[PDB]
Design a protein around this ligand. Structure first.
Ligand code: LUJ
Ligand code: LUJ
Ligand code: MG
Ligand code: MG
Ligand code: MG
Ligand code: MG
Ligand code: MG
Ligand code: MG
Ligand code: MG
Ligand code: MG
Ligand code: MG
Ligand code: MG
Ligand code: MG
Ligand code: MG
Ligand code: MG
Ligand code: MG
Ligand code: MG
Ligand code: MG
Ligand code: MG
Ligand code: MG
Ligand code: MG
Ligand code: MG
Ligand code: MG
Ligand code: MG
Ligand code: MG
Ligand code: MG
Ligand code: MG
Ligand code: MG
Ligand code: MG
Ligand code: MG
Ligand code: MG
Ligand code: MG
Ligand code: MG
Ligand code: MG
Ligand code: MG
Ligand code: MG
Ligand code: MG
Ligand code: MG
Ligand code: MG
Ligand code: MG
Ligand code: MG
Ligand code: MG
Ligand code: MG
Ligand code: MG
Ligand code: MG
Ligand code: MG
Ligand code: MG
Ligand code: MG
Ligand code: MG
Ligand code: MG
Ligand code: MG
Ligand code: MG
Ligand code: MG
Ligand code: MG
Ligand code: MG
Ligand code: MG
Ligand code: MG
Ligand code: MG
Ligand code: MG
Ligand code: MG
Ligand code: MG
Ligand code: MG
Ligand code: MG
Ligand code: MG
Ligand code: MG
Ligand code: MG
Ligand code: MG
Ligand code: MG
Ligand code: MG
Ligand code: MG
Ligand code: MG
Ligand code: MG
Ligand code: MG
Ligand code: MG
Ligand code: MG
Ligand code: MG
Ligand code: MG
Ligand code: MG
Ligand code: MG
Ligand code: MG
Ligand code: MG
Ligand code: MG
Ligand code: MG
Ligand code: MG
Ligand code: MG
Ligand code: MG
Ligand code: MG
Ligand code: MG
Ligand code: MG
Ligand code: MG
Ligand code: MG
Ligand code: MG
Ligand code: MG
Ligand code: MG
Ligand code: MG
Ligand code: MG
Ligand code: MG
Ligand code: MG
Ligand code: MG
Ligand code: MG
Ligand code: MG
Ligand code: MG
Ligand code: MG
Ligand code: MG
Ligand code: MG
Ligand code: MG
Ligand code: MG
Ligand code: MG
Ligand code: MG
Ligand code: MG
Ligand code: MG
Ligand code: MG
Ligand code: MG
Ligand code: MG
Ligand code: MG
Ligand code: MG
Ligand code: MG
Ligand code: MG
Ligand code: MG
Ligand code: MG
Ligand code: MG
Ligand code: MG
Ligand code: MG
Ligand code: MG
Ligand code: MG
Ligand code: MG
Ligand code: MG
Ligand code: MG
Ligand code: MG
Ligand code: MG
Ligand code: MG
Ligand code: MG
Ligand code: MG
Ligand code: MG
Ligand code: MG
Ligand code: MG
Ligand code: MG
Ligand code: MG
Ligand code: MG
Ligand code: MG
Ligand code: MG
Ligand code: MG
Ligand code: MG
Ligand code: MG
Ligand code: MG
Ligand code: MG
Ligand code: MG
Ligand code: MG
Ligand code: MG
Ligand code: MG
Ligand code: MG
Ligand code: MG
Ligand code: MG
Ligand code: MG
Ligand code: MG
Ligand code: MG
Ligand code: MG
Ligand code: MG
Ligand code: MG
Ligand code: MG
Ligand code: MG
Ligand code: MG
Ligand code: MG
Ligand code: MG
Ligand code: MG
Ligand code: MG
Ligand code: MG
Ligand code: MG
Ligand code: MG
Ligand code: MG
Ligand code: MG
Ligand code: MG
Ligand code: MG
Ligand code: MG
Ligand code: MG
Ligand code: MG
Ligand code: MG
Ligand code: MG
Ligand code: MG
Ligand code: MG
Ligand code: MG
Ligand code: MG
Ligand code: MG
Ligand code: MG
Ligand code: MG
Ligand code: MG
Ligand code: MG
Ligand code: MG
Ligand code: MG
Ligand code: MG
Ligand code: MG
Ligand code: MG
Ligand code: MG
Ligand code: MG
Ligand code: MG
Ligand code: MG
Ligand code: MG
Ligand code: MG
Ligand code: MG
Ligand code: MG
Ligand code: MG
Ligand code: MG
Ligand code: MG
Ligand code: MG
Ligand code: MG
Ligand code: MG
Ligand code: MG
Ligand code: MG
Ligand code: MG
Ligand code: MG
Ligand code: MG
Ligand code: MG
Ligand code: MG
Ligand code: MG
Ligand code: MG
Ligand code: MG
Ligand code: MG
Ligand code: MG
Ligand code: MG
Ligand code: MG
Ligand code: MG
Ligand code: MG
Ligand code: MG
Ligand code: MG
Ligand code: MG
Ligand code: MG
Ligand code: MG
Ligand code: MG
Ligand code: MG
Ligand code: MG
Ligand code: MG
Ligand code: MG
Ligand code: MG
Ligand code: MG
Ligand code: MG
Ligand code: MG
Ligand code: MG
Ligand code: MG
Ligand code: MG
Ligand code: MG
Lengths: 275, 48
RNA sequence: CCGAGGGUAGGGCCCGUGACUGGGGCGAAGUCGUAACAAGGUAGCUGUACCGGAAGGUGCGGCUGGAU
RNA sequence: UGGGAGAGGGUGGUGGAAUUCCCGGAGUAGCGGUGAAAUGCGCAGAUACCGGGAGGAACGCCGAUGGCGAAGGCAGCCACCUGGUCCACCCGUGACGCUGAGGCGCGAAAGCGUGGGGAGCAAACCGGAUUAGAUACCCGGGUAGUCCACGCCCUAAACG
RNA sequence: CGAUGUCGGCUCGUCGCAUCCUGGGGCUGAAGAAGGUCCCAAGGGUUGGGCUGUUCGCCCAUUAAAGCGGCACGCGAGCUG
RNA sequence: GAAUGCCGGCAUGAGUAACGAUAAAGAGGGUGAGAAUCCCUCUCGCCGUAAGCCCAAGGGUUCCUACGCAAUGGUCGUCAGCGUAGGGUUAGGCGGGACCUAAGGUGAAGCCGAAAGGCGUAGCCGAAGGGCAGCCGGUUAAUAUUCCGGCCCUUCCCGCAGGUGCGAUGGGGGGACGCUCUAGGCUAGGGGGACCGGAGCCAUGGACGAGCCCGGCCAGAAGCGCAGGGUGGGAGGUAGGCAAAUCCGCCUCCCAACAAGCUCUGCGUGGUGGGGAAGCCCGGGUGACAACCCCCCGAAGCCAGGGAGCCAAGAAAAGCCUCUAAGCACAACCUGCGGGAACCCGUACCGCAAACCGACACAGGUGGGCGGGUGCAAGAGCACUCAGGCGCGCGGGAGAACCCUCGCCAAGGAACUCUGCAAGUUGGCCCCGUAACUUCGGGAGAAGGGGUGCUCCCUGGGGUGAUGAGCCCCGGGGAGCCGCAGUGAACAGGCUCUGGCGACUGUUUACCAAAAACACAGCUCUCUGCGAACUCGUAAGAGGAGGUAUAGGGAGCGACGCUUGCCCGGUGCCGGAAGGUCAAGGGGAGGGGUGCAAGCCCCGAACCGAAGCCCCGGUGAACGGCGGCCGUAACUAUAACGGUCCUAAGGUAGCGAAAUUCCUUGUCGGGUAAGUUCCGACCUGCACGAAAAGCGUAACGACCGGAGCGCUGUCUCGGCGAGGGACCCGGUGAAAUUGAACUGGCCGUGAAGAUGCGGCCUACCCGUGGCAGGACGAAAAGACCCCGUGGAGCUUUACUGCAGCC
RNA sequence: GAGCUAGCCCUGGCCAGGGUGAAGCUGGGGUGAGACCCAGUGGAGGCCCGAACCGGUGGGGGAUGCAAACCCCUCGGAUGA
């Protein structure tokens, strides 16, 4: 896990790469890939609305199955585990015993050639999906719908998970990957097990070039700009921020909470995030 | 060095052409004004 | 051909020396405190960590070479 | 060969007590702390009481002058994996032994790297005291760390 | 202010004399030698370097001496920058 | 009569600068009124990874021929891309369209917006991407994969025969894919031949030779041959591929498996069709029944959708194949053969340039392919040269100063200078050898040296072929020869020690700054639970993201190492259901106006009443801040120590005369003969200091310092030489500027710096080459400065408002 | 008005030749098994020389220019941001 390199270039001594040892197939299922339109951070008006984006490697988008309740009771074999460049997690190729082929994000521990299934009567096993109400209290879980039949929304990234803390009426209590305590409907589906590829955070990009490969263009500090461009612009020589540190758009960027106060989901957020 | 005029027939007709003008209000008012001024030609000549 | 050596170039070892800087030994009666020897007035010693004008203090574990 | 004792080690799981916190209830004028106090906490409803929930660390009684380990060291309980040792029978090998410069491995605490974890405790730091002073002992706070995994550190009143 | 280019250097000189040297002098607390001071005198001469943008200044090695000033702090339609 | 007025005309500078790469010219013979300039020949130089050839843009008759020379052409002109006229561009296969999709554009549906309009699924458009059928040669003054010749092929229609469950905008397969490295076999291309064909040639001392010179092929249908690519067979089940499905997917079983078979390409051969040199003679004729053979090298191209590895994970749709739906099975589809049908547009010429973009026939700019040979290690580098193309559209002289580009230099050798600026030196390859330090890779081309040609002899292996010869590729040893010198010409690091800044590769002020600046991996803080936060938009809608806290936004800091202390009093931000203030609204004690009165109408206290602010806490890798005075030790000196005032707290580690130090060239040491710079120290740090990070740091740097070595024209201190200019002659012929000018020096005066006034001195009239002191020379209505109640960018706890948010 | 310039999207193209020799793989040594070491193979890299190409460091020229940014000598990078 995490391959290092000898320092034979300046950049190599810090660059690290994934071990890729869990991957078993190196080309995607043609039936489940579709072209991925690179935006470069521009919208239908043409304007950059997310700065510092563009120019990374071309990608194909693997269609992933965030529902899984559309095939209740139909077991599937884990055919392969594959690379997905659209996400931090690895994906698992499923061959359903009724013929259909799908991708799911690969939980940790999932091995090729094993049965998985979804439904209220499913066993509590790494890779199975159930409504949250049918999962024992205290089990880690991932790919969690935030509302019934609306799609898996929570605990998607590599290594993430969500622990079930308790039950209350139609609602179970989840500890999200951020540490927030939240109520999620018991009818929402979830997949027992944490998402795999936990060493994804120990990867060291080693040089600027790798960031460019990922479609990340160089970020330029407000302190480097001019007053026309940024609150931190200007100064003779260097200059401390000389005001509360602000975004390019004036609003303060140290501690200022921005969650909408009257947002209706607040009635279901038990505790804001930790740390 | 590389100068500002780099002719390109597709570009010329797609940018200043008759069909480009008629598509927007400002383009139609150009044509109205040029037609009123008596301009022999309302749009750049590009041989296509 | 070899050849004393001369020469150019780059290494190794040792000795002397250097603005300044580090502590050390030693030197009857200078200054600050009082850490240790009595339970030495916070039992002491301890490896380490961090701190403090200075002896020292404190955490963590260890020893009795600790009184009662 | 057949037995026996044991906190010997490693892995996964797990059980209750207590502390802190959070939510609900009930209740009101103080609580806390000391040699005595103050800082601090409390009518913005604390402390004391009940129910609930979260989380970490440590395992009371048994417990001992006890047991095991080469040493460091090892204590809730369950299971897996594994080390050492003792005894009986007197069956096998037939001196195959003792030690051990180098080597290699192990090695309390503290400390270090990358992640995680964080209740309690607590270097540093802050405050209240004491005091001539108090960079201390006492008190209220309190961050590393204390905990887990992996990788280094290799020291000790590592002592009989 | 419908523009008189601003330091220093380089190059090229030219002038003044309140003279650094060389020539002539008087006084000397001028024995000699060598000095001090003042007078006359502008003919000629008045070095090579280290440092600094430097002018100046300090220092090295010399020297008969290593003079002081003016010429838009001489000289950028001559150069340097 | 003046407006740096406006329009025009004509002057001045002036026969002046220049006439656009220094690749280069000369003579003869032509034509003509006229010739350095046009034509022809011979000689000379120049490009030759082009300065040659073929495409694509863009240009649009500039192409060909005839007739011209007014203007255009930097001179000339008989010439021309100029003027006039006539001619010239031929395709089912090349390119595009009647085929397909990409971004994007458009857009029935739907959504949104005062209007105009903005979105938007399908669908439509959109190509240098996918798909699709022509190759060799001949012919014209000018077109040719287009005309013609030879050999091939595609689609549509109809027919005939055979076969089959046929049938699609519907399902599926396929199309269909990255980067780096890469195998086998070929081909393009090239090298060689003592073999084959050829008009000849023997010089000038030798050669009648295994002599010189020239050439030795291109295309090709079926078949065959070599080399590859693609591809399991069959059956049973089947809930999935939005109806069906015999297909596809999933499952089971049987047999084949590195073959084979089928299928498709490439290369070879291939019936036949072409081509065919030098030389000689007038583009052609001959050569010539031309020959058309062997060997070697060999692609980056072909087989290809091959193989391997790697992470950053690598379009779509149609053609095509298959499956079935309605339907239809007299049909329809497939297969084979035959006849018939096959439209629109481009096609000239230029295309690294005199035809494109730069006002010019402009030393600049412009995408793709081919780009021969020899040698130098290789190569597209460099020198020469082939095919081919040019001698750059002013020339002839002269042989000054001076300028440019270049060569050399006695002795010295950085003494030059802000600075070794510049120019030397070094320089490729092989081998020997190589330091501190280091993150263990590096530093390293360290530094420093040796070798390098040619001949003869002996020999090792490789490729091809066959194992041999031959060619060809890497070497090894020994003896020699020559020169001043052997990468003999061309192309080809000067080196070292020590600081500063930044880790680094990168990036930037197009046109004065390439850096220490920006970026950067990495660290931290912070926001964000997803209809996310944030961004653009009135909105719809997008982006974020078809992502989900190991994620996405914002901010500082900026690899790595060791680290980042104290202050929450002020500002920000975060938390706080109490309290205080607080708007509309609720409330209506209590008044008022009016009317005869019911009534109508107006004012209006208490009290209830958000956010915000007050208030209570928190918070620094939030904005920020991190003291003063006096005294004291048994010599002096200095204060471990104490006293006191203030604060929210009084700067911790580490650094320090520094990219920071005013006094300052601080002081001491080092280096030097001498050192305001440099390096090392010290510490009264005017005014370092810890993520506007602090102290280090190997490696890196066209960054900025200091030193040394090497070597020099930088210098003492200049000299000579070359060429292109300057100069003279012929041709063409500008420019800024210009009140008019008959335009001297001194000392004065004058608005204070006089050719122009005074006095004096000096001076015959006009040029040409030179130098720049003056004409307060030219240029720009000073860019500094002030002034204007002139303007603009920027800031903020200036005013006021608006978005946004509450 | 993005036919210049800037960023992004889509689809194509280009980058001679020569150096260095990462991981892995193999064999060998080592050990209880390991780590590990040696050789070979291998061919990594915002690696090195150097064109084409992209630039524009220093100097000189040019300055009514060949050119409203050029010429010469030199120089940065050149499988990648
Ligand atoms: C004439 C010389 C007299 C001297 C004495 O000989 C010295 N020993 C010294 O004496 C000091 C003495 O100074 C100590 O004596 C030692 C120097 O000589 C040193 O103390 C240290 O001694 C070390 C051993 N040489 C260690 O034990 C440790 O570092 C100290 N204890 C000094 O700090 C001090 O402690 C006493 N309070 C006062 C006393 N007069 O200084 C004196 C000067 O006046
Ligand atoms: C004369 C020759 C010169 O001496 C050569 N230096 C070369 O000079 C060219 C020059 O060629 C470049 O100059 C270098 C030749 O060695 C190379 O550029 C590289 O130089 C490197 C430093 N030696 C680096 O700066 C970088 O790799 C390139 N800039 C060449 O591509 C070209 O760019 C100029 N426009 C025109 C110039 N005459 O070619 C000239 C003849 O063709
Ligand atoms: Mg690494
Ligand atoms: Mg390493
Ligand atoms: Mg993996
Ligand atoms: Mg698809
Ligand atoms: Mg997208
Ligand atoms: Mg759009
Ligand atoms: Mg943005
Ligand atoms: Mg962007
Ligand atoms: Mg993801
Ligand atoms: Mg993945
Ligand atoms: Mg829910
Ligand atoms: Mg990381
Ligand atoms: Mg990417
Ligand atoms: Mg980043
Ligand atoms: Mg940045
Ligand atoms: Mg700035
Ligand atoms: Mg700026
Ligand atoms: Mg702007
Ligand atoms: Mg602003
Ligand atoms: Mg600012
Ligand atoms: Mg600034
Ligand atoms: Mg500043
Ligand atoms: Mg700045
Ligand atoms: Mg400030
Ligand atoms: Mg602000
Ligand atoms: Mg906001
Ligand atoms: Mg939360
Ligand atoms: Mg340009
Ligand atoms: Mg263009
Ligand atoms: Mg076009
Ligand atoms: Mg266009
Ligand atoms: Mg148009
Ligand atoms: Mg017109
Ligand atoms: Mg008309
Ligand atoms: Mg128009
Ligand atoms: Mg000798
Ligand atoms: Mg005393
Ligand atoms: Mg004494
Ligand atoms: Mg003690
Ligand atoms: Mg004591
Ligand atoms: Mg005491
Ligand atoms: Mg004590
Ligand atoms: Mg302490
Ligand atoms: Mg109270
Ligand atoms: Mg907890
Ligand atoms: Mg026996
Ligand atoms: Mg703790
Ligand atoms: Mg106190
Ligand atoms: Mg240990
Ligand atoms: Mg003025
Ligand atoms: Mg004027
Ligand atoms: Mg002027
Ligand atoms: Mg005397
Ligand atoms: Mg006298
Ligand atoms: Mg004189
Ligand atoms: Mg001075
Ligand atoms: Mg003077
Ligand atoms: Mg002046
Ligand atoms: Mg003056
Ligand atoms: Mg002055
Ligand atoms: Mg000048
Ligand atoms: Mg000057
Ligand atoms: Mg002048
Ligand atoms: Mg001059
Ligand atoms: Mg008048
Ligand atoms: Mg006039
Ligand atoms: Mg006017
Ligand atoms: Mg006018
Ligand atoms: Mg006019
Ligand atoms: Mg006029
Ligand atoms: Mg007229
Ligand atoms: Mg005229
Ligand atoms: Mg006249
Ligand atoms: Mg004239
Ligand atoms: Mg003349
Ligand atoms: Mg003249
Ligand atoms: Mg001229
Ligand atoms: Mg000219
Ligand atoms: Mg000219
Ligand atoms: Mg030239
Ligand atoms: Mg030349
Ligand atoms: Mg001749
Ligand atoms: Mg001639
Ligand atoms: Mg004639
Ligand atoms: Mg002529
Ligand atoms: Mg003539
Ligand atoms: Mg001719
Ligand atoms: Mg002749
Ligand atoms: Mg050639
Ligand atoms: Mg085009
Ligand atoms: Mg034209
Ligand atoms: Mg004419
Ligand atoms: Mg004429
Ligand atoms: Mg004529
Ligand atoms: Mg005529
Ligand atoms: Mg003309
Ligand atoms: Mg011309
Ligand atoms: Mg044809
Ligand atoms: Mg038709
Ligand atoms: Mg309209
Ligand atoms: Mg189309
Ligand atoms: Mg096409
Ligand atoms: Mg075609
Ligand atoms: Mg053909
Ligand atoms: Mg069918
Ligand atoms: Mg179809
Ligand atoms: Mg594909
Ligand atoms: Mg694909
Ligand atoms: Mg393709
Ligand atoms: Mg890649
Ligand atoms: Mg061929
Ligand atoms: Mg060859
Ligand atoms: Mg079925
Ligand atoms: Mg014949
Ligand atoms: Mg190629
Ligand atoms: Mg291919
Ligand atoms: Mg492949
Ligand atoms: Mg599509
Ligand atoms: Mg029928
Ligand atoms: Mg069929
Ligand atoms: Mg038609
Ligand atoms: Mg044609
Ligand atoms: Mg060119
Ligand atoms: Mg031409
Ligand atoms: Mg133009
Ligand atoms: Mg121009
Ligand atoms: Mg010309
Ligand atoms: Mg050839
Ligand atoms: Mg070579
Ligand atoms: Mg060349
Ligand atoms: Mg010429
Ligand atoms: Mg002459
Ligand atoms: Mg000579
Ligand atoms: Mg010389
Ligand atoms: Mg020297
Ligand atoms: Mg020398
Ligand atoms: Mg020097
Ligand atoms: Mg000089
Ligand atoms: Mg050379
Ligand atoms: Mg060394
Ligand atoms: Mg070394
Ligand atoms: Mg170093
Ligand atoms: Mg090393
Ligand atoms: Mg060397
Ligand atoms: Mg030799
Ligand atoms: Mg020779
Ligand atoms: Mg070099
Ligand atoms: Mg060095
Ligand atoms: Mg920088
Ligand atoms: Mg840099
Ligand atoms: Mg730095
Ligand atoms: Mg660094
Ligand atoms: Mg950095
Ligand atoms: Mg680079
Ligand atoms: Mg610039
Ligand atoms: Mg500029
Ligand atoms: Mg500009
Ligand atoms: Mg420049
Ligand atoms: Mg640079
Ligand atoms: Mg920048
Ligand atoms: Mg950096
Ligand atoms: Mg860092
Ligand atoms: Mg963090
Ligand atoms: Mg907005
Ligand atoms: Mg999306
Ligand atoms: Mg920064
Ligand atoms: Mg270090
Ligand atoms: Mg504060
Ligand atoms: Mg506070
Ligand atoms: Mg505060
Ligand atoms: Mg209350
Ligand atoms: Mg309020
Ligand atoms: Mg402030
Ligand atoms: Mg403050
Ligand atoms: Mg500290
Ligand atoms: Mg200092
Ligand atoms: Mg100083
Ligand atoms: Mg100094
Ligand atoms: Mg410093
Ligand atoms: Mg300072
Ligand atoms: Mg100074
Ligand atoms: Mg000094
Ligand atoms: Mg001092
Ligand atoms: Mg700051
Ligand atoms: Mg700061
Ligand atoms: Mg650099
Ligand atoms: Mg640089
Ligand atoms: Mg030097
Ligand atoms: Mg000279
Ligand atoms: Mg000459
Ligand atoms: Mg004459
Ligand atoms: Mg003459
Ligand atoms: Mg004339
Ligand atoms: Mg003329
Ligand atoms: Mg007049
Ligand atoms: Mg007159
Ligand atoms: Mg006169
Ligand atoms: Mg006056
Ligand atoms: Mg006067
Ligand atoms: Mg006069
Ligand atoms: Mg007058
Ligand atoms: Mg008068
Ligand atoms: Mg007069
Ligand atoms: Mg006179
Ligand atoms: Mg004349
Ligand atoms: Mg003249
Ligand atoms: Mg003059
Ligand atoms: Mg003048
Ligand atoms: Mg004037
Ligand atoms: Mg004037
Ligand atoms: Mg003048
Ligand atoms: Mg003047
Ligand atoms: Mg001007
Ligand atoms: Mg004006
Ligand atoms: Mg004005
Ligand atoms: Mg003015
Ligand atoms: Mg002006
Ligand atoms: Mg002023
Ligand atoms: Mg005013
Ligand atoms: Mg006024
Ligand atoms: Mg104003
Ligand atoms: Mg404006
Ligand atoms: Mg304004
Ligand atoms: Mg408004
Ligand atoms: Mg453009
Ligand atoms: Mg491409
Ligand atoms: Mg390349
Ligand atoms: Mg190797
Ligand atoms: Mg391998
Ligand atoms: Mg590279
Ligand atoms: Mg190299
Ligand atoms: Mg390089
Ligand atoms: Mg230079
Ligand atoms: Mg000039
Ligand atoms: Mg210029
Ligand atoms: Mg140039
Ligand atoms: Mg060059
Ligand atoms: Mg390359």
């Amino acid at each position: 896990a995490v391959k290092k390199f000898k320092p034979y270039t300046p950049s190599r001594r810090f660059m690290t790469v994934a071990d890729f040892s869990e991957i078993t197939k190196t080309e995607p299922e043609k039936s489940l890939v579709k072209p991925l339109k690179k935006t470069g951070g521009r919208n239908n008006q043409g304007r950059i609305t997310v700065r510092f984006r563009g120019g990374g490697h071309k990608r194909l988008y693997r269609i992933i199955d965030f529902k899984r309740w559309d095939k209740v009771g139909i077991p599937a074999k884990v055919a392969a585990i594959e690379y997905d460049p659209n996400r931090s997690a690895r994906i698992a190729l499923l061959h359903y015993v009724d013929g259909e082929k799908r991708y799911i994000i690969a939980p940790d521990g999932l091995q090729v050639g094993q049965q998985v299934v979804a439904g209220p009567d499913a066993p509590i096993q790494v890779g199975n999906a159930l409504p949250l109400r049918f999962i024992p209290v205290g089990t880690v879980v991932h790919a969690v719908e935030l509302e019934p039949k609306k799609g898996a929304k929570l605990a998607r990234a590599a290594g993430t998970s969500a622990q079930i803390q308790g039950r209350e009426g139609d609602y179970v209590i989840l500890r999200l990957p951020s540490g927030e305590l939240r109520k999620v409907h018991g009818e929402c589906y979830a997949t027992v097990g944490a998402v795999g590829n936990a060493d994804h955070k120990n990867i060291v990009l080693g040089k600027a070039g790798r960031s460019r490969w990922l479609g990340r263009r160089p970020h330029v500090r407000g302190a480097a700009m001019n007053p026309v461009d940024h609150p931190h612009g200007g100064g003779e020589g260097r200059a401390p921020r000389g005001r509360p540190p602000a975004s390019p758009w004036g609003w303060q960027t140290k501690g200022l909470k921005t969650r909408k106060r009257r947002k209706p989901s607040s009635r279901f957020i038990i505790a804001r995030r930790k740390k | 060095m590389k100068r500002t005029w780099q002719p390109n027939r597709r570009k010329r007709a797609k940018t200043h052409g008759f069909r480009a003008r008629m598509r927007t209000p400002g383009g139609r008012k150009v044509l109205k004004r040029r037609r009123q001024k008596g301009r022999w030609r309302l749009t750049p000549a590009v041989r296509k």
